[PDB]
RNA sequence: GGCUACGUAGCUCAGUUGGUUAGAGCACAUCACUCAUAAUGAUGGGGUCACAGGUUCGAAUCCCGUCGUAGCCACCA
RNA sequence: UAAGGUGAUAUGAACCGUUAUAACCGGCGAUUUCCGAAUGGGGAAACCCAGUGUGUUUCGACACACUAUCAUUAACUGAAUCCAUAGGUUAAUGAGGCGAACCGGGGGAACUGAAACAUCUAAGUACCCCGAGGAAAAGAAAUCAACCGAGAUUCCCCCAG
RNA sequence: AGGGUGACAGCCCCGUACACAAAAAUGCACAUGCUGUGAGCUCGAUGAGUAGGGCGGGACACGUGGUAUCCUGUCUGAAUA
RNA sequence: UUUUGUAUAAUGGGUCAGCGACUUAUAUUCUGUAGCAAGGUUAACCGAAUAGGGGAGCCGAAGGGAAACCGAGUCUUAACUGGGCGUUAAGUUGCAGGGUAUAGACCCGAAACCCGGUGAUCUAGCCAUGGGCAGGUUGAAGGUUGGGUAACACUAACUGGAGGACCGAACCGACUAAUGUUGAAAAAUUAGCGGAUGACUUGUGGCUGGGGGUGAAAGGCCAAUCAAACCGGGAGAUAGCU
RNA sequence: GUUUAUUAAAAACACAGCACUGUGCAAACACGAAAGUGGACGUAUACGGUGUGACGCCUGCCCGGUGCCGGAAGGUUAAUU
RNA sequence: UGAGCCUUGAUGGAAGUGUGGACGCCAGUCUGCAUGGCUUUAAUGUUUGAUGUUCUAACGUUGACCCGUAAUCCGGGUUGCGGACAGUGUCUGGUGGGUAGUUUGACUGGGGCGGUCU
RNA sequence: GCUUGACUGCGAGCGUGACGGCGCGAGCAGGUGCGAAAGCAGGUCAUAGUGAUCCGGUGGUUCUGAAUGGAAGGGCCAUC
């Protein structure tokens, strides 16, 4: 569960980095709260074009 | 029923075995939980009775796919 | 059989990294006192550091073999 | 097809027929009360009671038809919440129950054997359950072989107690 | 062949061998019509919470045994010609 | 029949008739017999179907050694004067029979264990809704009025009508006896006995299910069955016993 | 008052009274793979469990054993890593 | 705040004012603090437990209100409470006659008790 | 006094057991001790002093090695 960010956020906030977050942190808060999204190897290209 | 809506995991029967190998019937049943999942693609939460792994699948494949299944298969949800 | 620990004054005991020179408590012993008893005080007798091999110039102080010893593990055709 | 017929116990009555509408046999139709999956609601099975539609030169009350549930699809409707969903009505389809074995699947004994008994056996048997077909299942090598080669699955005889 | 007939029937009866028959409905084959379905060539693609592993069981003749192999309740988790 | 031994007063049989217990399959070995013979024979399957085909295969012709391996020898050991097992006699396939193996394996018989069902129309308890208790006693709290207290206390009458209260029918029980014991009755009859406004008794209907129910507790009751109900099944359980 | 329906009605069971003990309520506890239900539409003057058994006078000593309650030290100790 | 290795601790311009520690058998008026021609006495980076706060936001709610809905079931919704606990799955040590299957020898001047068993 | 014959491989022939087994044994081969030598010694004056198989440990062993080389595992010898 690496995911890519969206806004700032915690000790990793950056509007679009590849972090390595804990899954529960990921698929219970950030994504449902729209602060990140999974890095599904398709996603590692849209925020790897900027 | 204790069936994982994602994997179809259900209880399975096996044995106990003592140090003397006495067999006593028993069941392994799955690590169910039931969990509010955000879809966004429907602006709603859906509670699936899900196994861990069921979760780990949803993590990987991603919800909507999994939801294509279930619906593809007829699961209520 | 494997892992721990521990047994040194007659009873009871710490001392515990050395290099110390063998205690404390009652027990034995005799003198001091006193009306005399016990309360007391003092000097000594008694340790053979669980038994034995070694590292060390100097092991109760570390290494090892058996005992005694209880803890539980754990093994047996 | 036909000279004889109206099932049997079962006579009798009254009939029917003989050259083709007597009976009898076969194909396809028609009718097909009530209960039963029972399906309009109920219920002590073969009964009680309805809503709505129809129906009457005697247009009341009764008779008949339809109204279960689930699924899929559509249509129309439509909360908390505006959107949107859930919810609700209708409609079209299909399901439901029964049935000998064979078949696949979910569960799954003990007696017994070991000259006792735990491992082991009986045995994935008996039994319960779900499902399907005329057969079921299996099947087109991430298989064997042993440096030579074979070439899906299934069944039979060997290999071999 | 067989059954029957007042006792045992090739020639009494019903059959049997053999040869024939379908107005209708049907099983099965083909042949087509209608519906639904896709064929063909070029260039591609090649089955990840999977394989494997840890724990627990179950299957393989095989009782964990030096035990390959298969299945998975549980926690994990690749390479990709 | 069983026994050391049975007229035995030890078993079994009232009598007759019919039925009633060593089977079947597949393996293996021996005997007989048949075929062929250092060879014998095919299995499935094909089939002109008891033929014919099919020799996959099985048995035998070589043994010894755990084995590699060697071979009329081989193993043992450094090695045998040796020693062990072998070298000399024929096998094999049918058919009949004697044994054995696997099966219910000569027939009948358990007490039980497991599985799925059917039972609270008896009884236990509980739930709901209805019914019953002739007649006669006892006289609790309380009340009233006099007496009595400073007022209460207390006291006498009268009134009142308490109780798992009293005597006693219906009703509910079941202490004694006799009768009955192939009964009138698979628990009663007769004479006595207990309770009888209560933890009473009763009609209807409901709920609880088998290692489970229910139990004012006896292992009681759960349909004349109870230290684990009944019906069907595993099932021909097993029976070193009769 | 109850009991062995059908050889035991009693000194047995029950009983009010007594004591210990559990239970803070989504109670303990019981039926139940679970949902749930009883406990109770109750709430510590309540409820379960256990022993004792109206009343009167009373209920002495022993915590070594077994059990239960308390005990944030230390010794030994599972999967795991 | 428990505990290792890395780290903030120590070892196999002369001379003046001169003071704790040194495995130091058994305690150096000697060295530095401003100045003078490969550890216990404890603490910064970690891999790791215990407790307490905070975060997000799972999860519980047999509190309240709203809708489905004239409904003490369920669901959805809002909210308060609880909150990474509780609970559950797999694994695992303890306890476990609550429940189950079984064992509990033979000889023997009956059996038991005794004795015996090579 | 000196010593390791309480030796390794074998074993004609016997005894004794239902059997598993146990016992006695001259002699052969290799190597050894004591004795000048003939010789004697394969434990003790003899008869008790003991435990089948399975499972497993250890040492040895080119005997086996699931395609092949190895290895695991097995066998054999010794022993627990």
Curated annotation (Swiss-Prot), chain A:
Q: What is this protein called?
A: Large ribosomal subunit protein bL9
Q: State the organism of origin.
A: Escherichia coli (strain K12)
Please give the subunit comment from the record. Part of the 50S ribosomal subunit. In stalled/collided disomes (pairs of ribosomes where the leading ribosome is stalled and a second ribosome has collided with it) bL9 in the collided ribosome contacts bS6 and uL2, while it contacts only helices of the 16S rRNA in the stalled ribosome; the inter-ribosome bridge thus formed is different from that formed between normally translating ribosomes.
Name the family the entry cites.
Answer: Belongs to the bacterial ribosomal protein bL9 family.
Question: What disulfide bonds does the UniProt entry report for this chain?
Answer: none
Superkingdom, natural source:
Bacteria
What the protein does? Answer: One of the primary rRNA binding proteins, it binds very close to the 3' end of the 23S rRNA.
Curated annotation (Swiss-Prot), chain B:
Q: Which Pfam families match?
A: Ribosomal_L28 (PF00830)
Task: Provide the GO biological process annotations.
Answer: cytoplasmic translation; ribosomal large subunit assembly
| Gene3D superfamilies the UniProt entry points to | Ribosomal protein L28/L24
Which InterPro entries does the UniProt record give? Ribosomal_bL28 (IPR026569), Ribosomal_bL28/bL31-like_sf (IPR034704), Ribosomal_bL28_bact-type (IPR001383), Ribosomal_bL28_sf (IPR037147)
Keyword annotations for this protein, in alphabetical order, are: Ribonucleoprotein, Ribosomal protein, RNA-binding, rRNA-binding
Q: Which GO terms describe its cellular component?
A: cytoplasm; cytosol; cytosolic large ribosomal subunit
Q: Which residues form a coiled coil?
A: none
UniProt-listed SUPFAM superfamilies: L28p-like
Q: Name one GO molecular function term.
A: rRNA binding
Please name the HAMAP family in this protein's record: Ribosomal_bL28 (MF_00373)
Q: PANTHER family, per this entry? A: 39S RIBOSOMAL PROTEIN L28, MITOCHONDRIAL, LARGE RIBOSOMAL SUBUNIT PROTEIN BL28M
Quote the NCBIfam families the UniProt record gives.
L28 (TIGR00009)
Question: Assembly and partners?
Answer: Part of the 50S ribosomal subunit.
By sequence similarity, the record places it as follows: Belongs to the bacterial ribosomal protein bL28 family.
What is the protein name stated in its UniProt record? Large ribosomal subunit protein bL28
Instruction: Give the species.
Output: Escherichia coli (strain K12)
């Amino acid at each position: 569960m690496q995911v890519i960010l969206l806004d700032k956020v915690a000790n990793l906030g950056s509007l679009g980095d590849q972090v390595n977050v804990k899954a529960g942190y990921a698929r219970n808060f950030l994504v449902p709260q729209g602060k990140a999204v999974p890095a599904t190897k398709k996603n590692i290209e849209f925020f790897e074009a900027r | 029923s204790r069936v994982c809506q994602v994997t179809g995991k259900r209880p399975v029967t096996g044995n106990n075995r003592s140090h003397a190998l006495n067999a006593t019937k028993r069941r392994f049943l799955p690590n169910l939980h039931s969990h509010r999942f955000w879809v966004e693609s429907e602006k709603r939460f859906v509670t699936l009775r899900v196994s861990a792994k069921g979760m780990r699948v949803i993590d990987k494949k991603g919800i909507d796919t999994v939801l294509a299944e279930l619906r593809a298969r007829g699961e209520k949800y």
